[PDB]
Amino acid sequence: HWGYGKHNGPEHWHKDFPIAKGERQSPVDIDTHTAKYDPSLKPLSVSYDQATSLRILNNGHAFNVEFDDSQDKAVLKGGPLDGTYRLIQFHFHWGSLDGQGSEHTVDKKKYAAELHLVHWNTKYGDCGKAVQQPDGLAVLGIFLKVGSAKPGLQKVVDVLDSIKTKGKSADFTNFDPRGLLPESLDYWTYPGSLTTPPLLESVTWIVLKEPISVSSEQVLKFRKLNFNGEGEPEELMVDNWRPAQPLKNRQIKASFK
Ligand SMILES: Nc1ccc(/N=N/c2ccc(S(N)(=O)=O)cc2)cc1
Numbered sequence: 001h002w003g004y005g006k007h008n009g010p011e012h013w014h015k016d017f018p019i020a021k022g023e024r025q026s027p028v029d030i031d032t033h034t035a036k037y038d039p040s041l042k043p044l045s046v047s048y049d050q051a052t053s054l055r056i057l058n059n060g061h062a063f064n065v066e067f068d069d070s071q072d073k074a075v076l077k078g079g080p081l082d083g084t085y086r087l088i089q090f091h092f093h094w095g096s097l098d099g100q101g102s103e104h105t106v107d108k109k110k111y112a113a114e115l116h117l118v119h120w121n122t123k124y125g126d127c128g129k130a131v132q133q134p135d136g137l138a139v140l141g142i143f144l145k146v147g148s149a150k151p152g153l154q155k156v157v158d159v160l161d162s163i164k165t166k167g168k169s170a171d172f173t174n175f176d177p178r179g180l181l182p183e184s185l186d187y188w189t190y191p192g193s194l195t196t197p198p199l200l201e202s203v204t205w206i207v208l209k210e211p212i213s214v215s216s217e218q219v220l221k222f223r224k225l226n227f228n229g230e231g232e233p234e235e236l237m238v239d240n241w242r243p244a245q246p247l248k249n250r251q252i253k254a255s256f257k
């Protein structure tokens, strides 16, 4: 099945998922000089005060921290969005080396990793329904660079030993995703897709300009995870990122001058 290796990686995905070559695929390179400030964008509202984390899961492609999305508890509103989008999960993409790992790039610069906070439009009732709609999801993307440690990431880092292999999960209650945000909410936005199969073209991307800093030690622990299940040959979970896709007939908008 699909993955990130030579024989099942991004260049193969189109055979099972023809939308891989579609008109609004993600990620993309963000050309900062071509992106235009958009005055029609309303203020972005990240409201994570009542966020209720449940569990952390190694799904064989990344790890997901999952949230209770049965009520308006952690929501994203404003910016390019109409209505209310509920946080369902977050995960990361990262590299084998500090010089790669992000999915989006900025003037072709690759960051060490990229955090995706995944939200679904409450007008569609559940995430499975939302992901089939052109305005179904909003993914808040945050770049990670290697430097000082991110204190708010350490609780994630320290549980990874318990979910080393595909299919393993662990309790992960009382985690506050506000500790993963940078100071500024300045962002770029464009219409795109899921960056993994099924690659559905249902995502409003909101990519923050300011990266967060994480330590080398923190990212090294991401790289100790396994793509494989328990008792199978070890394949380190690294380079689980899709490269930039053609922008085609899309304009990237900036929230800032
Ligand atoms: N039924 C179904 C199956 C797989 C799904 N995948 N959801 C996605 C969640 C977010 C991402 S991403 N990497 O944030 O674009 C990519 C996949 C979503 C729904």
Ligand SMILES: [Zn+2]
Residues within 6 Å of the ligand: 091, 092, 093, 116, 195
């Ligand atoms: Zn992602």
